[model samples]
Target: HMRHRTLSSSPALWASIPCPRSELRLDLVLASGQSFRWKEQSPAHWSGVLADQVWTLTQTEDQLYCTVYRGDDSQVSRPTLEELETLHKYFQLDVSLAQLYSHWASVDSHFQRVAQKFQGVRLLRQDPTECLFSFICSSNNNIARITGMVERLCQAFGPRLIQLDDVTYHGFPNLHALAGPEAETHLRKLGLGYRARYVRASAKAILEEQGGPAWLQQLRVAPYEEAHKALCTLPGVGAKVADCICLMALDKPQAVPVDVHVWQIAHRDYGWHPKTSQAKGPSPLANKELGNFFRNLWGPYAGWAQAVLFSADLRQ
Candidate 1:
């Protein structure tokens, strides 16, 4: 039986990451929450709990949390802050750090303004798994619907926690719970649409995948050219999604997930235009290296810097 939710393993660290009063929306999509047994913690300032041993399901704001459930038992993080910061650093690479703040102010006023405006922007850089899956659902979907879907998934799957107050909260479900033809059928019942195929396929691939971490490890050390190609091989993962995952998940500095919004970002602020007329969306910029221009301009945290400006354009 699912335990509903568990308590926080590390109270010291959670207090340090300034979350609470926030202005900008920092959306974090979960992945490991679905595929692995990454345990979530009990609700703190936000709601969460443990599922398995790994980390999953961290909430931001009053709403917008992740779901996670696969198995039982929790893993005590080793050496306290070392493990958390290691992963947190990887997650925070694109979003946090003092240098990133400087980059935003220099490259785009929107980001500079957002950083100043929203104290909670740091919440956006989250577990790689969530980021990967959520963006996959982002294909031509509306923001309101996407937000709704995330909440539904958490309610349906996630862990059954026994809280201090004798109530329970469900973490996100594991991929095993949503895999195969039958599971795929269930997701369709939930209204995932075309993304249903990709979700199921990616789940199957991760389980059946020979040495997934080892294979991914290659990308860790591999050059950007080789690493990106490997990521695109996953089902439903195109260039933009791949870049988003790489930048957000894999800690790639130059990764710019170019969508219709970002494309407009390029033209409106940077004056980057297509050589000829083309279709809508990411048509004008196609070169594998175009993202590099923004990366160079925005410095190391270009990916996060991009998000702040994208927010302003996203509103327009």
Candidate 2:
């Protein structure tokens, strides 16, 4: 069994990270369509399972408070400051989101407007393996239902972490667990439908390649194009999904994943005139054209630009 722990009912441990609400909007970061695992348990409180641990993160007016529960038995111990720092790294909290937006606003007029409305939106640095599979389920999918599929994937394959009161959270399944025969069959039953094969195939592809998740991890250091191509080799990953993995998982801020909404935005809002002159959704040719257009338009942080714009489009 995997080593793990759960939260105690009494004396819930608390740790603080000093950052103003204006700079770190936990609401936007969790509610943003970028990640799917978080659930607002109450108005200000949010809890989610990431990697093998369960965390409950809440915010105050000026500071952020996090309480973690990790160990095997119910004899709960508070997570160390070092573990708290790890969470900071996971959220990429050190990088000033405000500073990045200011830079974008200075260079581009359109982005200035986007920055104003969607302030304090930060790009999350997710676990590479979890991100790879989560985005795989994201093909032709919405955030709500994609979250459902991933939850089901976890429940079916992942180990049980803990049952807090009435809630039971599971860890993300290991690579070997997902690479097995049951991955396809069970994922289909779990509402994955067509994506079941893709998930299974992707897992098998990883296992067949040397180093498995470690190989995928190495892509962080690889060139963006090379990294993108390597990701495309995985089963069910297309250019769009590969780019999603690249941006969300591999820390490629320049990656732009074109979808129908973004395609429409590029043409209508950004005045992008594609070479093909198609004004519709992401076709093979159109995806390439619009993706390249934004990559050039937004430069190194194009992915961040897309997040703000995508947030606007998602709301509309």
Candidate 3:
């Protein structure tokens, strides 16, 4: 039988932090394809799982507010100091987004033009394991499909957290939960297609071969190239997916994941072209080459800058 723990029906007591929309726009950042779990329950209200708790977040002009929920018996209360700290760290709010935007705008004309309307497009510091597997499902998929697949994966393997309204939130499954023999078959049955094999193999590789979660944590402190290379060693993680993990999870700000959208941005806005010898295929420029070019152009936080451009393109 499924364990169902519903939250109390008391009114929510919100905890808030001083956050300007210029620094972190929840509407854009939450929906910007970096993380897949957040849902817009109302106009500007977002509900999602963060760690073991379900947080409903909404932002005003200068403050971010949140209500955290645990299991059934607990009263609806404000977030604890540690919980607020988690929110701070999750958003990486310590980084001065305005400063980064200024730097990118000064360096690149296209970024300046596009970024005027796309402020607060910061990279989320997601859990590396969840980030890796989620991007694996992202291959040959749209955001909607990936979101559904990820939710299904969590529901199938992860522990149920709490029920709020009609929805139940599940924690992200651990590597062991995903590494079992039944994982791939179950995932395939859930409509993950060939990605099921990739997810299962990658999970096993991390759990059995690599040092599991510790290995992924180490990549955060590794040099950018080293982290990217290490992540690429996993199944179904190519240059693009590896770079996504690097930027989003491992804190490699310069690791640009060159997708079709980024390629178009390069060619259309920046007038980028492949070398004569490299001009043979649909994606003529090597991932590293395009990534490095942007890294040089946008400096340390090129991936963050790329996210703004990517968001701008998506909004259009």
Best by lDDT: 3
Q: Give the TM-scores of the predictions, in the order they appear.
A: 0.66, 0.91, 0.94
- The positional error of residue 77 in candidate 1, measured at the CA in angstroms, is 16
| lDDT tens readout by residue for model 3, 1-316 | 2221222333357777999999998988888899999998767788899887888888889998888877657655678999999999999999999999998889788888877888888999999989999999999898899999999999999999887667788999999999998999999999999999999999999987887899998999999889888888889998899999999999898889987878788988998866533663345246557887899898988899988987888787
Model 3 spans > 4 angstroms off: 1-12, 280-285
Worst 10 residues of 2 by lDDT: 2-11
The parts of candidate 2 lying over 4 Å away from their true place are 1-12, 276-281
The lDDT-based order of candidates, best leading, equals 3, 2, 1
Clashes of 2: 2
238-311 per-residue lDDT for model 1 (tens digits): 88888877775565767787767667667776777554436433542453445766777777667766655655
Best by TM-score: 3
Cα misplacement distance, residue 71 of candidate 3 (Å): 2.2
- Residue 169 in model 2: lDDT: 85
- Is 1 or 3 the stronger prediction by TM-score? 3
RMSD of 1: 6.9
Number of colliding residue pairs in each model: 26, 2, 0
